[PDB]
Design a protein around this nucleic acid. Structure first.
Length: 57
DNA sequence: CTACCGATAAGCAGATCTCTCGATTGCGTATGAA
């Protein structure tokens, strides 16, 4: 282990494998700004998030 | 004889979560100053 420094209980299964990186890299936040006087739609437009009917339920 | 309405095959309106990007915006034809 790297914190205690003691040996682990069992031998770890370690090896080399081929690993690929994907392109799915998203976060949005608003307080005021663009706006039926309701806030605009769109992440890139500084919009909000719609509270759907199921959310109201 | 017959007015009214309850047994019988068929026409109209309506239906089926949230988010990010990208792309795109039918096709046609006439008047009048020179």
């Amino acid at each position: 282990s790297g914190a205690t420094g003691e040996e682990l209980r069992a031998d770890i299964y370690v090896g080399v494998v081929y690993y690929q990186r994907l392109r799915h890299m998203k976060f949005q936040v608003r307080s005021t700004g663009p706006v039926t006087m309701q806030p605009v739609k769109g992440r890139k437009r500084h919009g909000g998030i719609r509270v759907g009917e199921m959310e109201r339920d």
